[PDB]
Design an enzyme around this catalytic site. Structure first.
Site, mmCIF file in Angstrom:
data_model
loop_
_atom_site.group_PDB
_atom_site.id
_atom_site.type_symbol
_atom_site.label_atom_id
_atom_site.label_comp_id
_atom_site.label_asym_id
_atom_site.label_seq_id
_atom_site.Cartn_x
_atom_site.Cartn_y
_atom_site.Cartn_z
ATOM 1 N N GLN A 166 0.693 -1.308 -0.070
ATOM 2 C CA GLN A 166 0.041 -0.066 -0.122
ATOM 3 C C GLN A 166 0.713 1.056 -0.118
ATOM 4 O O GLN A 166 1.386 1.128 0.785
ATOM 5 C CB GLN A 166 -0.917 0.090 1.316
ATOM 6 C CG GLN A 166 -2.302 0.768 0.607
ATOM 7 C CD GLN A 166 -2.521 2.104 1.118
ATOM 8 O OE1 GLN A 166 -1.557 2.677 1.209
ATOM 9 N NE2 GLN A 166 -3.560 2.587 1.314
ATOM 10 N N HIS A 216 -2.051 -3.854 -0.240
ATOM 11 C CA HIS A 216 -3.433 -3.243 -0.854
ATOM 12 C C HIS A 216 -4.119 -4.340 -1.448
ATOM 13 O O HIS A 216 -3.714 -5.117 -2.249
ATOM 14 C CB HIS A 216 -2.857 -2.106 -1.894
ATOM 15 C CG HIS A 216 -3.933 -1.178 -1.962
ATOM 16 N ND1 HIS A 216 -3.540 -0.265 -2.769
ATOM 17 C CD2 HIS A 216 -4.976 -0.875 -1.828
ATOM 18 C CE1 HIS A 216 -4.613 0.561 -3.270
ATOM 19 N NE2 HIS A 216 -5.650 0.118 -2.381
ATOM 20 N N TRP A 258 -3.631 5.302 -8.757
ATOM 21 C CA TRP A 258 -5.130 5.366 -8.070
ATOM 22 C C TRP A 258 -6.032 6.690 -8.672
ATOM 23 O O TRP A 258 -5.458 7.613 -8.988
ATOM 24 C CB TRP A 258 -4.804 5.966 -6.551
ATOM 25 C CG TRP A 258 -4.300 4.960 -5.702
ATOM 26 C CD1 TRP A 258 -3.354 4.063 -6.038
ATOM 27 C CD2 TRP A 258 -4.349 4.946 -4.469
ATOM 28 N NE1 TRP A 258 -2.530 3.399 -4.764
ATOM 29 C CE2 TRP A 258 -3.441 3.849 -3.755
ATOM 30 C CE3 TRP A 258 -5.333 5.579 -3.316
ATOM 31 C CZ2 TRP A 258 -3.471 3.683 -2.700
ATOM 32 C CZ3 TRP A 258 -5.412 5.171 -1.979
ATOM 33 C CH2 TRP A 258 -4.207 4.219 -1.581
HETATM 34 C C1 LIG Z 1 -1.838 8.023 6.189
HETATM 35 C C2 LIG Z 1 -3.130 7.877 6.039
HETATM 36 O O1 LIG Z 1 -4.001 7.569 6.874
HETATM 37 N N1 LIG Z 1 -3.350 7.869 4.795
HETATM 38 C C3 LIG Z 1 -4.438 7.798 4.026
HETATM 39 C C4 LIG Z 1 -4.482 6.619 3.075
HETATM 40 O O2 LIG Z 1 -4.329 5.354 3.746
HETATM 41 C C5 LIG Z 1 -5.886 6.426 2.568
HETATM 42 O O3 LIG Z 1 -6.068 5.350 1.681
HETATM 43 C C6 LIG Z 1 -7.002 4.216 1.990
HETATM 44 O O4 LIG Z 1 -6.278 3.346 2.805
HETATM 45 C C7 LIG Z 1 -6.995 2.413 3.286
HETATM 46 C C8 LIG Z 1 -6.048 1.693 4.388
HETATM 47 O O5 LIG Z 1 -5.767 2.399 5.495
HETATM 48 C C9 LIG Z 1 -7.460 1.371 2.205
HETATM 49 O O6 LIG Z 1 -6.293 0.887 1.351
HETATM 50 C C10 LIG Z 1 -8.229 2.314 1.174
HETATM 51 O O7 LIG Z 1 -8.867 1.518 0.338
HETATM 52 C C11 LIG Z 1 -7.468 3.443 0.803
HETATM 53 O O8 LIG Z 1 -8.030 4.240 0.123
HETATM 54 C C12 LIG Z 1 -6.134 7.582 1.627
HETATM 55 C C13 LIG Z 1 -7.321 7.447 0.872
HETATM 56 O O9 LIG Z 1 -7.860 8.991 0.338
HETATM 57 O O10 LIG Z 1 -6.114 8.710 2.484
HETATM 58 C C14 LIG Z 1 -5.004 9.084 3.242
HETATM 59 O O11 LIG Z 1 -4.922 10.105 4.054
HETATM 60 O O1 LIG Z 2 -20.139 0.229 -5.352
HETATM 61 C C1 LIG Z 2 -19.214 -0.565 -5.859
HETATM 62 C C2 LIG Z 2 -18.029 -0.758 -4.610
HETATM 63 C C3 LIG Z 2 -16.847 -1.638 -5.333
HETATM 64 N N1 LIG Z 2 -16.548 -1.732 -6.464
HETATM 65 C C4 LIG Z 2 -15.535 -2.530 -6.791
HETATM 66 O O2 LIG Z 2 -14.584 -2.819 -5.584
HETATM 67 C C5 LIG Z 2 -13.443 -2.231 -6.025
HETATM 68 C C6 LIG Z 2 -12.947 -1.653 -4.540
HETATM 69 O O3 LIG Z 2 -13.745 -0.669 -3.968
HETATM 70 P P1 LIG Z 2 -13.317 0.767 -3.919
HETATM 71 O O4 LIG Z 2 -12.611 0.837 -5.063
HETATM 72 O O5 LIG Z 2 -14.237 1.723 -4.164
HETATM 73 O O6 LIG Z 2 -12.444 0.864 -2.392
HETATM 74 P P2 LIG Z 2 -11.319 1.834 -2.480
HETATM 75 O O7 LIG Z 2 -10.060 1.675 -2.823
HETATM 76 O O8 LIG Z 2 -11.389 2.891 -2.642
HETATM 77 O O9 LIG Z 2 -11.096 1.763 -0.886
HETATM 78 C C7 LIG Z 2 -13.713 -1.285 -6.752
HETATM 79 O O10 LIG Z 2 -12.579 -0.571 -7.385
HETATM 80 C C8 LIG Z 2 -14.486 -1.831 -7.812
HETATM 81 O O11 LIG Z 2 -14.009 -2.584 -8.508
HETATM 82 C C9 LIG Z 2 -17.782 -1.497 -7.534
HETATM 83 O O12 LIG Z 2 -17.668 -1.806 -8.544
HETATM 84 N N2 LIG Z 2 -18.965 -0.795 -7.035
#
Ligand SMILES: CC(=O)N[C@@H]1[C@@H](O)[C@H](O[C@@H]2O[C@H](CO)[C@H](O)[C@H](O)[C@H]2O)[C@@H](CO)O[C@H]1O
Ligand SMILES: O=c1ccn([C@@H]2O[C@H](COP(=O)(O)OP(=O)(O)O)[C@@H](O)[C@H]2O)c(=O)[nH]1
Ligand SMILES: CC(=O)N[C@@H]1[C@@H](O)[C@H](O[C@@H]2O[C@H](CO)[C@H](O)[C@H](O)[C@H]2O)[C@@H](CO)O[C@H]1O
Ligand SMILES: O=c1ccn([C@@H]2O[C@H](COP(=O)(O)OP(=O)(O)O)[C@@H](O)[C@H]2O)c(=O)[nH]1
Ligand SMILES: [Mn+2]
Ligand SMILES: [Mn+2]
EC number: 2.4.1.87
Lengths: 288, 288
Positions: B167, B200, B276
């Site tokens: 991640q 991740h 992302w």
């Molecule tokens: C340092 C900190 O908190 N940073 C966060 C990111 O972690 C965050 O991403 C999300 O992270 C969670 C796990 O912690 C998971 O992987 C989510 O899918 C991911 O999107 C990010 C999101 O915009 O914000 C930062 O501030």
């Molecule tokens: O309403 C939804 C929620 C999730 N997803 C699938 O699940 C993944 C994980 O969800 P998301 O990406 O939103 O999680 P995040 O990374 O933002 O945390 C997405 O990329 C999509 O492939 C989707 O298709 N529709």
């Protein structure tokens, strides 16, 4: 070692029909092939088989789904297959569910104005796709009309360097009654006294190299005719027959592989693998 | 035969980052891999690589096209690839043109009511598809989120039995700062004092056999938590991390393979292969 004709082909299982040509190529009829032996051989070679199909205009709604649904179920079962679909409106392409070892790839093509050119232009487009990607993706390729449906297993026993289909209505006819292009002015011309069989343009295949030559020579004849202000009686089919007269196919498929039920069902047709869709030109064609 | 790590992996090229784990698995950073050596190796074995991606609801319009267009261009170039696309509404599915060695397969799935379940159900669905067909079609499979875009070559250097993704926000953090599920009541629970890295869930892969175990075990934890009235902090990602803690991945990908530009671009990130997509939950999600 290599595959031998007798390894999988036994002509004596069908003594009542033509099973061999004078140039030693087999004519595959139900009962003469050992698909089990071939599925093994080819599995070890890890082959992939391609299949091209065009659908322009109302042919999309009328035949594309039925064609693909049946192809998924019966075409080269047990081996990786790629369906290459060419349509003029991808928004109308039916994304039906495919089964194990099947995948697809769709392409948007220009719709020619005359259905005759739609049918003939396929020769050009196929050649381009073979050069661009098909030669890198498959070991063998079949090119088929969309106005037909698979009825039973159409497998590896049909694979070969160059493969031709015997047109259902003429397999027993004398060559001189064949509907070959008879006008000398056409590049597809075949004089009386010549010809082995009448091949159906609805199905043909072989390795990408062979299919490329087949499609390239056919399109060259098509273009030559246009320069001489003439158009073959049965379009690209006439040119295909001229091609197969000069370059004998290494394998021919029996009418069981492309049957027209309008003929009825005679004793020679033991197991139909594909059948023609009834013609509906009044609705699916918009010219001539 | 016998592919050895030194044949293609040189950690000394990136002495400033973690390139090897304690259990002998390499962490792939730009500069450490010899893709040329690997491409030749895998080409000789005629491998096919699969990629699954789900798009339910507005994720289809917002991310599916971009994802696929980029995958076609950068994912496992030079090798047969099959994209398995899971959507709830096939009519909104963008059917982009694919290039050499790329082919599609689309499946209609049921949309779960909560986005949390859409995200977590993937584990179940992937497993089902592996058994039904993917195990017979590919040698390796990657399962990815759709809200990201390939920026550069993501090739054979990423293949392995079980592959995990670091991640981007925590690859330099201490285990005790990782956002693991810390509630002992959850099947995804990881105690403080334990853990190797924070993986991740946006990217993970391996052989069909391994991915089937990864997915099956995560879903089991997901179902168990439901029976205990608890839902992991980061849903299936929490379970994935618990899984990779017990069953160490045989290969890990650096953040360069799944980077978030909002962090900016530090010296450690030499060449981004994927990025992302900005979050847009207000529109793409229908519940809190
Ligand atoms: C340092 C900190 O908190 N940073 C966060 C990111 O972690 C965050 O991403 C999300 O992270 C969670 C796990 O912690 C998971 O992987 C989510 O899918 C991911 O999107 C990010 C999101 O915009 O914000 C930062 O501030
Ligand atoms: O309403 C939804 C929620 C999730 N997803 C699938 O699940 C993944 C994980 O969800 P998301 O990406 O939103 O999680 P995040 O990374 O933002 O945390 C997405 O990329 C999509 O492939 C989707 O298709 N529709
Ligand atoms: C004996 C006879 O005249 N039979 C015809 C069929 O030939 C005909 O099929 C068409 O045949 C031409 C070649 O002659 C070409 O292959 C066409 O694509 C094909 O459809 C059939 C059509 O309904 O009618 C029979 O009576
Ligand atoms: O308007 C047309 C004309 C032809 N074709 C394609 O060309 C093939 C040959 O035409 P057709 O089948 O109509 O010829 P026939 O066998 O009837 O002689 C078809 O199967 C289609 O794939 C098409 O899609 N639209
Ligand atoms: Mn036809
Ligand atoms: Mn995501």
């Amino acid at each position: 070692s290599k595959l031998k004709l007798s390894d999988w082909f036994n002509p004596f299982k069908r003594p009542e029909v033509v099973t061999m040509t004078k140039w030693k190529a087999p004519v595959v009829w139900e009962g003469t092939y050992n698909r089990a032996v071939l599925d093994n051989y080819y599995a070890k070679q890890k082959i992939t088989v391609g299949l091209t199909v065009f659908a322009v205009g109302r042919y999309i709604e009328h035949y594309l789904e039925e064609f693909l649904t049946s192809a998924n179920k019966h075409f080269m079962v047990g081996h990786p297959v790629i369906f290459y679909i060419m349509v003029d409106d991808v928004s109308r392409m039916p994304l039906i569910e495919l089964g194990p070892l099947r995948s697809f790839k769709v392409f948007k093509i220009k719709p020619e104005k005359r259905w005759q050119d739609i049918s003939m232009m396929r020769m050009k487009t196929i050649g381009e796709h073979i050069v661009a990607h098909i030669q890198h993706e498959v070991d063998f390729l079949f090119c088929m009309d969309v106005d037909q449906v698979f009825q039973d297993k159409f497998g590896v026993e049909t694979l070969g360097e160059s493969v031709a289909q015997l047109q259902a209505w003429w397999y027993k006819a004398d060559p001189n009654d064949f509907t070959y292009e008879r006008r000398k002015e056409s590049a597809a011309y075949i004089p009386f006294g010549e010809g082995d069989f009448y091949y159906h343009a609805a199905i043909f295949g072989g390795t990408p190299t062979q299919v490329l030559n087949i499609t390239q020579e056919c399109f060259k004849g098509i273009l030559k005719d246009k320069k001489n202000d003439i158009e073959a009686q049965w379009h690209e089919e006439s040119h295909l027959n001229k091609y197969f007269l000069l370059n004998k196919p290494t394998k021919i498929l029996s009418p069981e592989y492309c049957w027209d039920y309008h003929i009825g069902l005679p004793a020679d047709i033991k197991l139909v693998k594909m059948s023609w869709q009834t013609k509906e030109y009044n609705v699916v064609r918009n010219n001539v």
